[PDB]
Amino acid sequence: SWDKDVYPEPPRRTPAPSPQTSLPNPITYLTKAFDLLVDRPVTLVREFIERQHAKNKYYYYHREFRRVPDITECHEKDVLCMFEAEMQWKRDYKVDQEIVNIIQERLKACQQREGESHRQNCAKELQQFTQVVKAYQDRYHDLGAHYSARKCLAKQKQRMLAERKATKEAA
């Protein structure tokens, strides 16, 4: 399963079709035949397989980590500090890429659910998409292929120093 609050779904809206005239309705007979020829046997097969699964019990756990301190607390060379620092940063980088993947899947799903009126009830998700992706464009973008962690902190210092000069001019 999945949380309904990270992959959100609006509530369902489904009409009840009122037939004006009486031919009637080939697809209703065909979907009842579909139910009787497909829906029952696959349900019986899945129920058998689920009983065979629930005879025994496996479990897999989620791997979790700790917070090794910083790269801002590591010294000149000290390779057994920078190692834990940059692996912690690289795992943050992977999980942040997947944050961007989740938001972009939400944008795709808002496109396909809301139909031929795109701009109704997709303003909020496009807003948060441009927000998180503006953060990504600011934070990880223009460093290249040989990122380790140190070019990211150099970009951090250079950007906040440039904005410090900008707000000094704005003072």
Binding site: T130, V133, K134, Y136, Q137, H141
Partner: protein, 128 residues
């Protein structure tokens, strides 16, 4: 009623209207006869090397081997660097290279100046 059929390097002059075929020297008759003799001797040698029931492999065409070794290995001799060869070499080898190098310098200087000003459409330009 004729536009005289000017030829070109791609529209070949056909065998009908030469019109040098219609005023004939006797030496051209001798030339056509000896050319027929050459092709007849070549076909005779080929057909005798062609219908042997004992022969198994290929016929070893010497003109094809001669053309191949003329085209691959025998280009480098003969050669001398002439004014024409040096001119055409430095034209086809360096000219377009330095042209595309100038246009890449121009485009990259425009792009880096424009993003130093920052007025590009990189509102989201993620997959760089």
């Amino acid at each position: 009623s004729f536009p005289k059929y000017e030829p070109s390097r791609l529209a070949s002059l056909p065998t009908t209207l030469d019109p040098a075929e219609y005023d004939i020297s006797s030496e051209t008759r001798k030339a056509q006869a000896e050319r027929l003799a050459i092709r007849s001797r070549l076909k005779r040698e080929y057909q005798l090397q062609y219908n042997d029931p004992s022969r198994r492999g290929v016929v070893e065409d010497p003109a094809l081997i001669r053309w191949t070794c003329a085209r691959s290995a025998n280009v480098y001799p003969n050669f001398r660097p002439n004014t024409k060869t040096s001119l055409l070499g430095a034209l086809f080898g360096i000219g377009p290279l330095i042209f595309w190098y100038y246009v890449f310098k121009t485009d990259r200087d425009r792009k880096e100046k424009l993003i130093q000003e920052g007025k590009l459409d990189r509102t989201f330009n993620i997959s760089y």
